[PDB]
């Protein structure tokens, strides 16, 4: 029974919320520009773009 209550108290110590979001994998930031090339060019595919013009 003491093992029971002990496990209980374990749960009570551990049922507390995590202080924040916690680290995992944020490694290697994605390219901003290959994304833009996919977006634009694959959407610009087969188009007669005249650059930007004034």
């Amino acid at each position: 029974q003491l093992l029971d209550v002990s496990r209980q108290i374990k749960s009570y110590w551990l049922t507390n919320s995590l202080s924040t979001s916690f680290p995992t994998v944020d490694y290697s930031e994605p390219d901003l520009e290959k994304v833009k090339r996919t977006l634009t060019k694959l959407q610009n595919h087969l188009l007669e773009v005249s650059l930007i013009e004034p």
Partner: protein, 54 residues
């Protein structure tokens, strides 16, 4: 007393009573014998009941 082709001393009540007490508590202890400690305790799993097949 004439038990018919037998005659007997009259038993103490306490004798048979002790027989009852002893045999009963013996049934208790025997219930504790070849039965106990099969439900093995766990804080997590709780009591366990091993089998070749449950």
């Amino acid at each position: 007393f004439v038990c018919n082709e037998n005659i007997y001393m009259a038993p103490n009540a306490y004798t048979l009573l002790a027989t009852r007490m002893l045999n009963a508590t013996y049934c208790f202890q025997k219930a504790l014998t070849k039965i106990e400690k099969f439900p093995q305790y766990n804080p997590q799993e709780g009591y366990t009941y091993p089998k070749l097949s449950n």
